[PDB]
Design a protein around this ligand. Sequence first.
Ligand SMILES: C[C@H](CCC(=O)O)[C@H]1CC[C@H]2[C@@H]3[C@H](O)C[C@@H]4C[C@H](O)CC[C@]4(C)[C@H]3C[C@H](O)[C@]12C
Ligand SMILES: [Ca+2]
Length: 124
Amino acid sequence: ALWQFRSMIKCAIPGSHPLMDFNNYGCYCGLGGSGTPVDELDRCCETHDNCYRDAKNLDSCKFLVDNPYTESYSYSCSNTEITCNSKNNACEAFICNCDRNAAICFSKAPYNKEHKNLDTKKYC
Ligand SMILES: C[C@H](CCC(=O)O)[C@H]1CC[C@H]2[C@@H]3[C@H](O)C[C@@H]4C[C@H](O)CC[C@]4(C)[C@H]3C[C@H](O)[C@]12C
Ligand SMILES: [Ca+2]
């Protein structure tokens, strides 16, 4: 679920700021998404959206209000390392891994302040 995704992010990036949650980034981070990602970090968010879209396409998976962000799973954090519980069901596991991969992706990508709260109608 979304709140767990946020938790994974704090796990992989201990120094990230809580207030950042009020903002969006690039063309895909925290947005519906449009155009092409502006940088590596934004690409991580687009890839995450594609991951969720793939999950929804799983005929065997149904999410509350068709929103994968509502799907709670089980995961653990240890020394900035994220682990998805093997006992999550197939649908939850897909989402957990989408979140996990995105969190790791974020931790390695450069953060460009100029892309925070981007003028999407113009650059996306
Ligand atoms: C981890 C990363 C970098 C933080 C830093 O260097 O301080 C930040 C930059 C923009 C952030 C994203 C944006 O704030 C948009 C979304 C806000 C939601 O509350 C969480 C997911 C969400 C998709 C955030 C994931 C993560 O916290 C991002 C990707
Ligand atoms: Ca669940």
